[PDB]
Amino acid sequence: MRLEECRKRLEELEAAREELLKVLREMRIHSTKSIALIHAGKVEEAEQELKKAIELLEKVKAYREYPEIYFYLCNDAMQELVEAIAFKNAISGEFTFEIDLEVTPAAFLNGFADAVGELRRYALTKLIEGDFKSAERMLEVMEKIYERLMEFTTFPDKLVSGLRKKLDVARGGIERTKSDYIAAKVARL
Amino acid sequence: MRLEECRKRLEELEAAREELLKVLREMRIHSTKSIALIHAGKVEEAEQELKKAIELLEKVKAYREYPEIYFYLCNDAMQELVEAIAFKNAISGEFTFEIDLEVTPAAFLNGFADAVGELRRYALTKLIEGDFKSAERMLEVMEKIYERLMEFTTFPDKLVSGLRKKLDVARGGIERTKSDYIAAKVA
Amino acid sequence: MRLEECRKRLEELEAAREELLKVLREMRIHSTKSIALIHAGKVEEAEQELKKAIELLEKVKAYREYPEIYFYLCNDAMQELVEAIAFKNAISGEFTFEIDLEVTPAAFLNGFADAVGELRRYALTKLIEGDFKSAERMLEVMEKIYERLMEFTTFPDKLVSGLRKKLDVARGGIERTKSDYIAAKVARLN
Amino acid sequence: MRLEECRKRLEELEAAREELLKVLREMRIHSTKSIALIHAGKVEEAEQELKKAIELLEKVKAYREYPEIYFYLCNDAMQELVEAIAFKNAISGEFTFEIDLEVTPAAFLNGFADAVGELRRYALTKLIEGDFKSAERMLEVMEKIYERLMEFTTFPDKLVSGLRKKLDVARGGIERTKSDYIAAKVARLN
Amino acid sequence: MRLEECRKRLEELEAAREELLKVLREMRIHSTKSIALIHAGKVEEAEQELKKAIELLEKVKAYREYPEIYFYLCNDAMQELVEAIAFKNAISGEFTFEIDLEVTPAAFLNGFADAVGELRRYALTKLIEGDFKSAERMLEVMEKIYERLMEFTTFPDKLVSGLRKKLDVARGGIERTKSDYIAAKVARLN
Amino acid sequence: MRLEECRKRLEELEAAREELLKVLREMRIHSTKSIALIHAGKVEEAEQELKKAIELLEKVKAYREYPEIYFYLCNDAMQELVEAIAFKNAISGEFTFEIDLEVTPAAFLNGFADAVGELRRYALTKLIEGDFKSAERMLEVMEKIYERLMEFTTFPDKLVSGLRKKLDVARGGIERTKSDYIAAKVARL
Amino acid sequence: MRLEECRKRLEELEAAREELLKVLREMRIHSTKSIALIHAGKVEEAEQELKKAIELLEKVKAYREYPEIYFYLCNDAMQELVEAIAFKNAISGEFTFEIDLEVTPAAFLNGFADAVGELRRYALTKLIEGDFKSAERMLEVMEKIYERLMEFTTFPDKLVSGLRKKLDVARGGIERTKSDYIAAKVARLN
Amino acid sequence: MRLEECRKRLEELEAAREELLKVLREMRIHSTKSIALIHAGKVEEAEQELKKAIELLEKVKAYREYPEIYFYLCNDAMQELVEAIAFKNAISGEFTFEIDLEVTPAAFLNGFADAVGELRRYALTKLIEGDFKSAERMLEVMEKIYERLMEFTTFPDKLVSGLRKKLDVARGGIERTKSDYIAAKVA
Ligand SMILES: [Mg+2]
Ligand SMILES: [Mg+2]
Ligand SMILES: [Mg+2]
Numbered sequence A, F: 001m002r003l004e005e006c007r008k009r010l011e012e013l014e015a016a017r018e019e020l021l022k023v024l025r026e027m028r029i030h031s032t033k034s035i036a037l038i039h040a041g042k043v044e045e046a047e048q049e050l051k052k053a054i055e056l057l058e059k060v061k062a063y064r065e066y067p068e069i070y071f072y073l074c075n076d077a078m079q080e081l082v083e084a085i086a087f088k089n090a091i092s093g094e095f096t097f098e099i100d101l102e103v104t105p106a107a108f109l110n111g112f113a114d115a116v117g118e119l120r121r122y123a124l125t126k127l128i129e130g131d132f133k134s135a136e137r138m139l140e141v142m143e144k145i146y147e148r149l150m151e152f153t154t155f156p157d158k159l160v161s162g163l164r165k166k167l168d169v170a171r172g173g174i175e176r177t178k179s180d181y182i183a184a185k186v187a188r189l
Numbered sequence B, H: 001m002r003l004e005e006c007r008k009r010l011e012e013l014e015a016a017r018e019e020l021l022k023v024l025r026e027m028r029i030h031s032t033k034s035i036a037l038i039h040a041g042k043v044e045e046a047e048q049e050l051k052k053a054i055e056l057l058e059k060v061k062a063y064r065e066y067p068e069i070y071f072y073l074c075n076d077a078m079q080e081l082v083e084a085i086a087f088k089n090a091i092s093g094e095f096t097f098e099i100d101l102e103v104t105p106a107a108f109l110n111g112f113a114d115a116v117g118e119l120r121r122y123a124l125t126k127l128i129e130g131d132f133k134s135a136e137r138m139l140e141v142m143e144k145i146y147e148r149l150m151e152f153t154t155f156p157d158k159l160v161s162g163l164r165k166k167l168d169v170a171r172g173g174i175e176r177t178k179s180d181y182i183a184a185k186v187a
Numbered sequence C, D, E, G: 001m002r003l004e005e006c007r008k009r010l011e012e013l014e015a016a017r018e019e020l021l022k023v024l025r026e027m028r029i030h031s032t033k034s035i036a037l038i039h040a041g042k043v044e045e046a047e048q049e050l051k052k053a054i055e056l057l058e059k060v061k062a063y064r065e066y067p068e069i070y071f072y073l074c075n076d077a078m079q080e081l082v083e084a085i086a087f088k089n090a091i092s093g094e095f096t097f098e099i100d101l102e103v104t105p106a107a108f109l110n111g112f113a114d115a116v117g118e119l120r121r122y123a124l125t126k127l128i129e130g131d132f133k134s135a136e137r138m139l140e141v142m143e144k145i146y147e148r149l150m151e152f153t154t155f156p157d158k159l160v161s162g163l164r165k166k167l168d169v170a171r172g173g174i175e176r177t178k179s180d181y182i183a184a185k186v187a188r189l190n
């Protein structure tokens, strides 16, 4: 009976949604912890955390058999994964846009932009630790990321989520980093 | 080279959105026209426009491969179709819930509540032209849609959409029709 | 020199916008006024107000020289004008979609849809007076507007804006005018 | 026939909207591409992209016969064009307010204001690479734009839109770039 | 001392608000209690409750020295008082428009309109108990109120508020009560 | 550690909230089913359902050990319990305002008002089944309920939830029922 | 006869409200105008506009005879007046909370809080010019307004409305004016 | 007779609401005043106002017996108190998380984030008057509140309130302070 079909379907969907929440939740805990680690220096720890998070992403990819919902929740989680990943990669010199994950275009671009602000914070801590070279290479990757991401601004911001705004944010932060670098050189006299 | 990949994919999605937009718009125009005819009396042509629409629906059933969109846009047209169909089925005795259209539970359910309103408008017009039989049968079906759909009200609003509110609206229309019918019987 | 230009254009547009605001609001007021004067029985005085409005309309058309501002403000006052005119034509048997003035299409459509409800007012009141004939005619024109209008719901928003909501409004209004027509037929007796 | 005229004009307008939107988009993709090129150095290809865009402005101007939709949708793209142009001029030492385009005054003013931020970014990036010269000339055009622009904010916001905020932003950048300049000066005694 | 004057007046105003609110509340509790009494039949105690309420109107009028807060908050209670009064007058055969209170015109008009629904309720409940008389006299005052009141809706809604809606409601009840009347007539041939 | 305390606390609260949702959910299913039963005639069935529902209310009352949340969700459920109960009681002649449950004043008053619209629907079905006496006694209890509930209008509607509006609704409905009765007598000729 | 009265009062209030709207808006415009004229350097012309405003204010005070309408519209224009005056007094060393005109307390407080941001504008621009003295003065008065105002956050809304929001606004503005002041002290050098 | 009972209970609730309203208002005046003094320099009197406030808090701790309200109104004041307290603790070296106040987890956490802003305002003022030691210690505490509080972000927003957004705000304030401090060191 079509009503019993749609009823069964609805229960499937509900249970689904609940566990999906749980998974995405754990994944985001790992992402975040990872970023805080990198920030505080403990990058091996970070790597391991990220690894856990990717496994969890496999469990997530499992759920796309119900495309209604799923995307209605995943995005956030996904971005931060991307974000955190790029972050390790940047502060390790192994930075690349060649992150081969099962992720949506909007989540990918926004995670990458999200990493910019992270790199500003890092470059600030280094700047204050009187380390100018790390700061400067961070700045280099900030810039790189921005310059390359703008290419996508053309697309309707509905299609690409809140990119344009995010990028303007990034941009202004990049400039602030640069002003700071200069001020740090003068102030290291 | 990835960035080039996610960009090709974006271009796709844009094309697909434009196309789905136009499909669904067409399909709606038909569902709408179908209803307007069922009211106007030309039930045959209603069956026609309806068929055209369902054909367009099977044309919609392609873009599942683009789940990043699809569902989002689809609902309000799917729910529209489900409405018109049910309406026809009630205004030709053949009222059933068991129709297969592969439509999101929400657009299904809500499409059926959505029907009740169109039923009370009909029933009322018939009541004005004397037809108490129409009106009585409609009161039967209307009460059935309500009695049945209410079983799904306990579900999280996030999946069943706003079924409860649509339902209460219907209920009230049912009462107002029962009442409009105890009148008129004063001839 | 460039800036001198765009500056002068600006000052011009400023004074223009002020005046446009005054004239538009006076027009709208006069439109509405006429509509309520009909519902109050002073249909002649209502003709006087509607006249005043249709006059001010001209002075409003004179601001099309400034397509910057002319359009961001057009909508509402003229929606009301269309309403009042639709109504007048309707309560006077010679109702028509053919009203020889444009006036944006959105304003036009929303205006008719908005005159549906004033028609219900007039029809329930005609029902109270006793007169079922005029009541049935008003119910006819109401239904007609609803049908002829629903055809444009296809079009997206932006171009159409109000329509869908205003037509579901007019709809529920039509159901009520009808129910009232039925309970009205207990005469019949008497 | 009133309902049929309106249906016609409706179809026309939606079509026109689709087109205008795509073309505006194009003009914009080139505007942005251009500014990126300037920031890269490739000023030649920059000027080319500008060219393509200003070609597009023709196709766009072709739509001011539908004033509804035209003065709504047009702002962004135009305003950003003016930005690209004014930017490029400023970095070629050939900065002027005497750009001539069929363009809404808001879009114009806002285009210059918007250019100011791009100047500051260029001026910092140079001032990092040492070029104290380029920097100072940039700060110069910056203050220029802010100073002459500020007298247009005696206009009611609705005529002038985001100008205020932009000038606020502008103001800030100016004051900051100054500091940055000075700081690099003492930085490169050593 | 400007900041100190302002704090003073502030404290005064908040206090005045607390008081006005409580007193208005009182006046209202009696207004409602009154209408309930009339619906019960106990017209004596009805008249008493009216008394208590109109006594309260003194304490309330005492606040129009703070026009800020007074003309905002006052509407409901006053309006409902005029309702109770007009209602009781109508059912004592002594219905008049010549209530005299220090009361805002919106509140006044709205009070009469509001009374109309209470009349319809009474008229139905009598017409159920047979009293065809009481019913018909009620319908009479109903039509009176609607008919006189309708000429006030030539006023812009902001001055007149809910009147229109209430008159809408009113109109409805009138037309329906008529029906009901007739239906009971044929009902009690048998 | 105060941080770990507030952490543990937060987990407790979360689990709590989840199961409380489940309970209130089941309760409301029973309420509603009960009302549809009574409407369709099957009042013994209805009784049993209501019984289930009260047991579930015991399980709910269990949770008041976390008064933050709880009330932030219960209300709805509670009202309908009240509503449905009064409803059986009214159509059974055993109507009373003496429903002795562990319920909030606002839930209680609003449930009771909510029952009025139910009784209108009932009295309409009876009216159409040409049964005028049941209609009339229902109308009697509608009226009684209203008349008695108004007494509470005085209280600030924040304190008593959306009572006043609810009562005006009820009122108009009562009048509609009455017009209908009359029209039913004339139309039974 | 009663209705004749409350009718005449109504028509009176209608004309009055129209005229009040015009006068209020003109006043507000003139206030704002003055403020932007100061931020554009034409402080004398700004003196002229602010004069015009303070004059129109009187004609506005003349409408206190109609406490129905006078208060539902008071707020915004006078908030702006208070703003422009506070600002004038502040950019002219002789700043004071003691401005000998009331003017509702809400309008007063919100007005000062809203002048905080115009003060930051003036202070950042003063910082750009080079002048740190006047900058520090402005920063003082800003901070002073913030402190003297926070004292009123206790009071509920209704009486105060805007406050807490506008003060968190002013706050973040003060932090920015400060940060700018610090990076401004790289002169010091030069 | 029940209806009379629930009526008495209502009257109660109204009374309790009025009273709680006034208590919390008083308490917030104090918390606020306390902060304003900590900024102004009168740290002692800040300790005083704070104490009066906490006394009023133990006065608040009665109305638990009226859960139908209480929590609802309390949060924004409780969260306020928690703020002021933490602020004092940081501007006198004695910064700790471990304080007992029996306050809703949300008002606790969000109170501590709330603190960071006041810290950056302080730190900035000190930075203007030359005090780099103040500012540096504040940068330490600020970073600590952020680092620690971020552990609770994974929780449903419905229980932890909007902690994440408040936190990002703070973070940004921390950067802008680090930056404002790399300046000024240019003397
Ligand atoms: Mg981040
Ligand atoms: Mg730019
Ligand atoms: Mg009433």
Ligand SMILES: [Mg+2]
Pocket: F083, F114, F115, F117, F118
């Ligand atoms: Mg119910």
Ligand SMILES: [Mg+2]
Pocket: H083, H114, H115, H117, H118
């Ligand atoms: Mg704070």
